[PDB]
Amino acid sequence: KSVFVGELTWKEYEARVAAGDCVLMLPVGALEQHGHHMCMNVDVLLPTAVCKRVAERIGALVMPGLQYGYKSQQKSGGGNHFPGTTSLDGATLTGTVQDIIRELARHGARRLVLMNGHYENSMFIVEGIDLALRELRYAGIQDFKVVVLSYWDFVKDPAVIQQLYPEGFLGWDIEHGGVFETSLMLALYPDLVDLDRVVDHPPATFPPYDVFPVDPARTPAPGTLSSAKTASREKGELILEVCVQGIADAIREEFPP
Amino acid sequence: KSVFVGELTWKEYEARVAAGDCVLMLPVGALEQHGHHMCMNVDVLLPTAVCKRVAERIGALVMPGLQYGYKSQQKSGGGNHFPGTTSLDGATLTGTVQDIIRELARHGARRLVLMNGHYENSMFIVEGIDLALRELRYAGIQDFKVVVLSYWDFVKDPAVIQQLYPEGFLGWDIEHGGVFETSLMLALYPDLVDLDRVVDHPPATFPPYDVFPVDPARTPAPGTLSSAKTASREKGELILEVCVQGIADAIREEFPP
Amino acid sequence: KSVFVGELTWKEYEARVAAGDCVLMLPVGALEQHGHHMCMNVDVLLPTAVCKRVAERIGALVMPGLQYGYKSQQKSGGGNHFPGTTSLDGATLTGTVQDIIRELARHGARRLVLMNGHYENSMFIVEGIDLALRELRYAGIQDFKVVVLSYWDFVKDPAVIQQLYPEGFLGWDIEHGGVFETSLMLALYPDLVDLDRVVDHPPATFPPYDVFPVDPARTPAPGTLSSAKTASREKGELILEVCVQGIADAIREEFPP
Amino acid sequence: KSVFVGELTWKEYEARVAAGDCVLMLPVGALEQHGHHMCMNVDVLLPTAVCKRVAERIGALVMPGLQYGYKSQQKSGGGNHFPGTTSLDGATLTGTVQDIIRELARHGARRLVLMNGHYENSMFIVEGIDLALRELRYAGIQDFKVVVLSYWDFVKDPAVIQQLYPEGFLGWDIEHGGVFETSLMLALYPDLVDLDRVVDHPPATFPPYDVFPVDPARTPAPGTLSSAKTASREKGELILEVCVQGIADAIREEFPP
Amino acid sequence: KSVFVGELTWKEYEARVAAGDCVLMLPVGALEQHGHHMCMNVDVLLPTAVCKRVAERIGALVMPGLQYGYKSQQKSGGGNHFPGTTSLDGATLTGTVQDIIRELARHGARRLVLMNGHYENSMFIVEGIDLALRELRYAGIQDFKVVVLSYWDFVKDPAVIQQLYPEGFLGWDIEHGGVFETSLMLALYPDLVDLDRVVDHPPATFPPYDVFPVDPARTPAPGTLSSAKTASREKGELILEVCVQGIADAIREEFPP
Amino acid sequence: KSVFVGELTWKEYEARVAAGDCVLMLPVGALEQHGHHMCMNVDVLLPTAVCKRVAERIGALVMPGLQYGYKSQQKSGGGNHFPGTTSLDGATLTGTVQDIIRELARHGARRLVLMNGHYENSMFIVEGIDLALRELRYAGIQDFKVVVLSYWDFVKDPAVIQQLYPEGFLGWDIEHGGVFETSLMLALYPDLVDLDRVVDHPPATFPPYDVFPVDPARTPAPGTLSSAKTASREKGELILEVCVQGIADAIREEFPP
Ligand SMILES: CN(CC(=O)O)C(=N)N
Ligand SMILES: CN(CC(=O)O)C(=N)N
Ligand SMILES: CN(CC(=O)O)C(=N)N
Ligand SMILES: CN(CC(=O)O)C(=N)N
Ligand SMILES: CN(CC(=O)O)C(=N)N
Ligand SMILES: CN(CC(=O)O)C(=N)N
Ligand SMILES: [Mn+2]
Ligand SMILES: [Mn+2]
Ligand SMILES: [Mn+2]
Ligand SMILES: [Mn+2]
Ligand SMILES: [Mn+2]
Ligand SMILES: [Mn+2]
Ligand SMILES: [Zn+2]
Ligand SMILES: [Zn+2]
Ligand SMILES: [Zn+2]
Ligand SMILES: [Zn+2]
Ligand SMILES: [Zn+2]
Ligand SMILES: [Zn+2]
């Protein structure tokens, strides 16, 4: 039986919400350049894949993912000047999250996990949540609860980190098109990665400020912020198990049966 | 090679747009109840599948689809009071279309086909197009051209109509969860249809006005506006060929090499 | 005693709402080209005249009409590229409807009929209604009821259609500046019609898609979508009687005294 | 021939704009309580009547009027708590003005007089103008010129002020439903005034601050801010000529042939 | 102890609101040209200084002031074409006021004085208040009360006006950079005024209409609307005492223990 | 002469912009709880003080600061559920930044430094900049340049961190009301800090997700995310010297004479 809301009938969905402890999950991604070696829908594919596996384990349901996210920023995604990257304005993304929460609440759902896969989305997701909860409070509804997370933050264990990051962990911001995402894609969707096309460059660095209009010269030419040369299917399987396990555990604590 | 932009690298996408006559296609759907016998992501699946086949034929590319559409209306989708149906506000959908066109224009793209799969979306797509073209004009850009269509409108041939609907054509508005959509789904995604669960009610009728708040008693209980009892894979293949050929021809005419 | 809210004192209006069953009616029109032979305020004049007569029969009141409507579309109104046509953005029209409903509800009114006279307004009226009912629900109010209708939909009886169209009906979309509107204008405001200036072209036809920017060649040069050559005062008188009776009956059904 | 754009064909309008110096005029009103003795559409009727007469004199055209205006304020209009008064949000009024200027500019018009008839509208009209002119500049259009006025400000001659206000002029703010508007209505629309119903209270006074929520006790009970007991048709004809002459002269100065 | 909320800890603020009759005051200013002789933050400095003194006297607290206000208008502030003047759009100002009231209500505050220092702000403050009170009404809250005032309106007393203006008071609209503001600044912030730089022109006069785009020729070249040649510290101390006493008394009347 | 734009006349400001290389600086803060020991306007005071000193060194000017910022988040500011914290919606803050940039560009300014003092503001500042630059491009203006920075990012040097934190640096997110801000306040505004009121709790830790509505138990009771027990004036003096030097150097690099 599918864990995807889109693949259920309305009667099946209605029955699941009627159970009374139904957890819904919404992947939030982007269409964004991910270097010479990888396709552009990574930020949708990855959180969706993690949601699917988590949902199988905890008996949750997964909503259709948000395919377009906030403008790529130089220090976390290369920058929005790249071809292919197709970004929403903040108000549009916020409004989309807001509308979806409104509707889930109308259905009777009261438990939502927003799983972000594109670094830049976070604060617009937060605003969408706040505006939706504000509206629910207008109608006397205070029992809608949201958990929001970026899936990579669950990769915390010192031992796990040492495997993908031999010379050190430099941050989730510069994991754009690098070892983390490329490894996951080798594990899940190998036909969409070509590791021989990786342009091996040093981890991108930046001064402690930002400049607009964005200057293309300050992003590595391929659009990646770190090299995925050492990425592997094995690394991807490790990340996947650690994420799925950690997120399933967190969701059970926040949304117990 | 994939016809989906999301499955391309940014370099591959850039090269396709650089050729100068590149046609992009954007499916616009919904998450919406489709009766007891069918799943809720039909309005995304169907135009996406048509886009894919058209794109293969004419050498176009397909953008990630809009998964959430405008509020279901009683006379064309059963109504937004149903569980599962998850709808955007008009401003949100319009803004999403507007943002995407802005970004495609930034890439250098100048040819877009919006393929609607949810009846209620049309006017909000139209407004998104207008607002986007207005903004392009502010930059002296007047060579961006948009074709918008709902894929069912290409099924016009009287002989084909009789083959699909022996008892008579009942209008595309009450083809919600009926013979047309169900037949297409039987041909493309048979596991998401269970024809044994079809409730075989007479076609929905309404007076020449609408009432809000939506009154659930005026929609057939299953949520369908007509019966899919006579739906079949064969009808689906006929529809699919008529739509793909007709749309392929139309796009070749409007966007010639 | 006047049926127009604008022609009442606030005390007279207050007393009518205090009866507890008062029906208010809001004409929603446009300023739009209507060919060489007719003036541009038709879409206001016609629903206002119908509202007046319905209100006289059923004891309703009529609000000041919306004078500007949504952008003219090629297939229904000739297109927004014509001179004279003066159109609102979707958000503006939606917001206007939303504000008016808020205010009527504040007065204690709970029964509203929106009578549309311009084809393109419909979905923005729908959104304005939804947003207003949403806000009322925030205040625990769910007894405000809205009927929305386009007045031409009440010309439906086969006997009536045959009498008005002895050569055949051809649809409401291409009844822009054709026999229907022109006949009504000949009956109500003959000084605003010059039938000698009618250009007698064949009915407009279009492919099953739309193109933006609009291509002006696909609209008949005069701006009409069908010929009003056979329009008459008598046809207009029949349309008027049928519309008024039908709408009066519908409103009594939905809003019994 | 008519001076109202709504009563012209699009060809007649196009020809008038093509002449090169065409002045358009837009009345901006309200639906608002005006005491026990006058109807609620005064703020539309009066500037529309003044526009008509000015247009006849100077060869201008008059657009359909804005029927709904900004929220009535206690110190100028009695307050928005009154029945009947039906007010827009600021953003709605601003957007309406903005949309209309955009469209007039599209037609090729470059001269607009906005004639305000409701005190509270002014700053939202100003913002609408500013936003519209900002957008026009984005397209390299800097030759659209707008004159905005409230018609009563043209009553400046001390001899006229004394005829209306022999005990002294107290300001246009408390001139709500008093001698000025009532006199004009007695001259123009006598059937919409019943002077026997005037409540002859002392002129409304307020402290140098404003309180929200609006306190109904601080407005004179009938909703008028001053008594119309001394209003007369003769005074109305005087006001009408003074306004029409003064506005015609101002428009000739600002928009010379 | 400080009367400024910004200079309190959250515990100190919490305790003051917990008392039950706490009055908060919000200065609303502008960054705007004020002639050759005076700095551009006058409209913040002055209401803030008055707020401080009133708050000391009545035991109120003062919120951080709004530093940026609505677009300067020719007849009241010289016009928004001047350098230095940095103005918000109406929606931005309205939204700021709205957000602050929402948050103060969340804290449990129920008494707010908005003290305006920039003529043009008034209607956007009014709209922000209305939108905030609207949202509070959704939650059943009707005990949040707002007093709004422009501080100069409290200089009313005929005797006071004679001392400040022996040769005649000429209205608050042209008191932009003139005797009133300049005198206050000489009393409070003498280093920010250089009276030798005053350009002594006649009081600004305008016709009874406005023109956009703003024509710079119709504003006195220095940007002032009246001459501050006779401004003095003595006049400033009189104004200050009159304003502080008057406003203190008004706030005690409206927000008593 | 003052480095604050508010303290200049419009002529002085105009002259500085006319020089051709004028750098403007805009502090962007918040009104936010900062523990038991410190006042709530810290996030305005601190970046304003740094801006003042930088401006004095490099010959720049400082605009009036944004006093209200985005909603406090649990992991960086304790959460928006605290009293005193007074937060804007995202759209409001974005619009404020957008409006100010528009206006500065109108003055002829082309170089802006946005100095953020409140962690949560960052993405809304980014969106405001993008929308403003988008509008400038509509007018052919592409030479407006913006540098955005949070002043604490310039305390980077290992030797400086070692001196300030002999026990260990634990990150900027939990430097809310801790050693960093409190030390700066002891150096700049000692009367607004009372170190005896510091609650000396262990550093705040959180799971790798966020929950809404915020659970107040996850924030330390005082609202601080780390203890300021060891804060000192001397630490503050060093932070100030390091920040001012680093930022002055960065601005000269990006905006050379
Ligand atoms: C973690 N990621 C992946 C992405 O969002 O592309 C970052 N770029 N920071
Ligand atoms: C054509 N359709 C299918 C759909 O949009 O669900 C209608 N319901 N009218
Ligand atoms: C019936 N009408 C009337 C109108 O909107 O002008 C159509 N244009 N379709
Ligand atoms: C001048 N007027 C007329 C009106 O707006 O109704 C005032 N109310 N002050
Ligand atoms: C009273 N004021 C002061 C100001 O707003 O600058 C006027 N400009 N009219
Ligand atoms: C450094 N700061 C200070 C603040 O924003 O209050 C962080 N919260 N990170
Ligand atoms: Mn990304
Ligand atoms: Mn549908
Ligand atoms: Mn029409
Ligand atoms: Mn009025
Ligand atoms: Mn001012
Ligand atoms: Mn902060
Ligand atoms: Zn990614
Ligand atoms: Zn469907
Ligand atoms: Zn029409
Ligand atoms: Zn009036
Ligand atoms: Zn001032
Ligand atoms: Zn802080």
Using DSSP, state whether C252 is helix, strand or coil.
Answer: helix
**Extended strands (E) in chain D:** 24-28, 61-62, 111-116, 145-150, 210-212
Q: How many CB atoms lie within 10 A of CB A143?
A: 10
Residue type, F123: M
A111: β partners = A145
**Are C109 and C22 within 8 A, CB to CB?**
yes
> Do the Cβ atoms of D83 and C10 come within 8 Å?
yes
- How is residue F6 written in tokens? 């508010």
Helices (H), A80-231: 90-107, 122-138, 158-164, 179-188
F31: β partners = F86
Domain holding D83, by residue range, is 1-257
- CATH number where C169 lies: 3.40.50.10310
E237 CB-near residues (< 8 Å, 6+ apart): E187
Burial state string for A220-235 with b = 16 or more CB within 10 A and e = fewer than 16:
bebbbbbbbebbbeeb
Nearest to F73 by CA among F30, F42, F116: F30
Q: Kind of pairing, strands A111-116 and A145-150? A: parallel
Query: Of C89, C120, C130, C200, which residue is the catalytic one?
Result: C120
- How is residue D246 written in tokens? 């003064």
Ligand 11 centroid to residue E40 C-alpha, Å: 9
Ligand 1 atom showing the smallest separation from residue A174 Cα: 9
Using DSSP, state whether C214 is helix, strand or coil.
Answer: coil
**Are A98 and A128 within 8 A, CB to CB?**
yes
Residue with tokens 């008509």: D52
DSSP A212-232: ES--GGGS-TTS-SS--TT--
Instruction: Enumerate the known binding-site residues of E for Zn(2+).
Output: 32, 34, 43, 118, 181
Sheet holding F111-116, edge to edge: A210-212, F145-150, F111-116, F24-28, F61-62
In angstroms, the first-to-last Cα distance of chain A is 20
Dist. CA E241–CA A7, nearest whole Å: 73
Using DSSP, state whether E150 is helix, strand or coil.
Answer: strand
Nearest to A105 by CA among B103, C173, B83: B83
Ligand 16 centroid to residue C189 C-alpha, Å: 30
Number of domains in chain F: 1
Kind and range of the H or E run holding F228: none
Task: Give Cα E249 to chain centroid, integer Å.
Answer: 18
Ligand 7 centroid to residue B16 C-alpha, Å: 22
D28: β partners = D66, D116
Cα radius of gyration rounded to whole Å, chain C? 19
Angle between helices E10-18 and E90-107 (to 10 degrees): 70
Kind and range of the H or E run holding C60: none
Kind and range of the H or E run holding A202: none
**Which residues, by Cβ under 5 Å, contact ligand 10, an ion?**
D 30, 32, 43, 77, 118
CA distances from F74 to A81, A94, A143, F78, F81 (A): 33, 19, 19, 4, 9
Dist. CA C170–CA A198, nearest whole Å: 62
CA distances from E13 to A160, F33, F39 (A): 47, 10, 10
Using DSSP, state whether C210 is helix, strand or coil.
Answer: strand
> Do the Cβ atoms of D85 and C14 come within 8 Å?
no
Burial state string for E174-211 with b = 16 or more CB within 10 A and e = fewer than 16:
bbbbbbbbbbbbbbbbeebbebeebbeeeebeebebbb
Dist. CA B197–CA F184, nearest whole Å: 70
CA D227 to chain E, closest CA, distance in angstroms equals 24
Dist. CA D175–CA D153, nearest whole Å: 12
Nearest to B12 by CA among A33, E93, E59, F63: A33
Ligand 6 atom showing the smallest separation from residue F176 Cα: 8
Q: How many CB atoms lie within 10 A of CB B233?
A: 15
F214 CB-near residues (< 8 Å, 6+ apart): F74, F79, F80, F81
DSSP E84-146: S-B-B-HHHHHHHHHHHHHHHHHHT--EEEEEE-SGGGHHHHHHHHHHHHHHHHHTT----EE
Q: Is B20 exposed, middle or buried (CB count within 10 Å of its CB: 0-12, 13-18, 19+)?
A: exposed
**Are E30 and E68 within 8 A, CB to CB?**
yes
Angle at F90 (CA atoms; ends F87, F91), nearest 5 degrees: 120
A144 within ligand 1 shell (Cβ under 6 A)? no
Angle between helices A90-107 and A10-18 (to 10 degrees): 70
* Residue E9 main-chain phi, psi, to 5 deg: -80, 165
D244 CB-near residues (< 8 Å, 6+ apart): D50, D53, D54, D57
Give A-chain residues touching F242 at CB under 8 angstroms.
none
C147: β partners = B211, C113
Ramachandran assignment for D24, one of left (phi > 0), alpha (psi -120 to 50 degrees), beta (any other): beta
Using DSSP, state whether C43 is helix, strand or coil.
Answer: helix
Angle at F195 (CA atoms; ends F189, F198), nearest 5 degrees: 130
CA distances from D138 to A251, B137, B168, F138 (A): 50, 9, 53, 5
> Do the Cβ atoms of F67 and E67 come within 8 Å?
yes
Residue to test with chain F: of A147, A210, A215, most F Cβ within 10 A? A210
The binding-site residues of ligand 6, defined as CB within 6 angstroms of any ligand atom, are F 32, 43, 76-77, 118-119, 152, 172-173, 175-176, 181
- Among A44, A45, A76, the mutation site with the greatest number of ligand 1 atoms within 8 A of its Cβ is A76
DSSP state of D79: -
Give E-chain residues touching A137 at CB under 8 angstroms.
139
Nearest to D78 by CA among E132, C102, E249, C11: C11
CA E23 to chain F, closest CA, distance in angstroms equals 14
**Which residues, by Cβ under 5 Å, contact ligand 7, an ion?**
A 30, 32, 43, 77, 118
Residue with tokens 């008057």: E246
DSSP state of B153: G
- How is residue E185 written in tokens? 């600044």
Dist. CA E123–CA E60, nearest whole Å: 25
Dist. CA A82–CA A213, nearest whole Å: 13
Angle at D102 (CA atoms; ends D97, D107), nearest 5 degrees: 125
Dist. CA F129–CA F148, nearest whole Å: 9
* Residue B114 main-chain phi, psi, to 5 deg: -95, 120
Dist. CA C51–CA C150, nearest whole Å: 11
**Are A92 and A145 within 8 A, CB to CB?**
no
- How is residue E98 written in tokens? 């709205």
E6 CB-near residues (< 8 Å, 6+ apart): E63, E64, F31, F39, F40, F41, F44, F67
Nearest to A3 by CA among B69, B65, B198, B39: B39
Ligand 5 atom showing the smallest separation from residue E181 Cα: 3
Number of H helices, E strands in chain E: 8, 5
* Residue E71 main-chain phi, psi, to 5 deg: -45, 125
> Do the Cβ atoms of C147 and B254 come within 8 Å?
no
Q: Is E253 exposed, middle or buried (CB count within 10 Å of its CB: 0-12, 13-18, 19+)?
A: exposed
Nearest to C257 by CA among C20, C17, C77, C25: C20
Helices (H), chain C: 10-18, 42-58, 74-77, 90-107, 122-138, 158-164, 179-188, 233-254
Ligand closest to Cα of D152 equals: 4
**Are C150 and C116 within 8 A, CB to CB?**
yes
The binding-site residues of ligand 3, defined as CB within 6 angstroms of any ligand atom, are C 43, 76-77, 118-119, 152, 172-173, 175-176, 181
Dist. CA D9–CA C38, nearest whole Å: 6
Dist. CA D247–CA D154, nearest whole Å: 7
Dist. CA E98–CA E102, nearest whole Å: 6
B89 CB-near residues (< 8 Å, 6+ apart): A95, A99, B71, C127, C131
Nearest to B92 by CA among B30, B144, B14, B6: B30
Resolution (A): 1.6
Q: How was this structure determined?
A: X-ray
DSSP state of D201: P
B149: β partners = B115
Residue with tokens 């209006």: C13
Residue to test with chain E: of A138, A141, A142, most E Cβ within 10 A? A138
Using DSSP, state whether E66 is helix, strand or coil.
Answer: strand
Q: How many CB atoms lie within 10 A of CB D143?
A: 10
DSSP B45-88: HHHHHHHHHHHHHHT-EEPPPB---B---HHHHS-TTSSS-B-B
Angle between helices B90-107 and A90-107 (to 10 degrees): 140
Query: Of D107, D157, D176, D234, which residue is the catalytic one?
Result: D176
Burial state string for B197-215 with b = 16 or more CB within 10 A and e = fewer than 16:
ebbeeebbeebebbbbbbe
The chain C residues in contact with chain E (CB within 8 A) are 135, 138-139
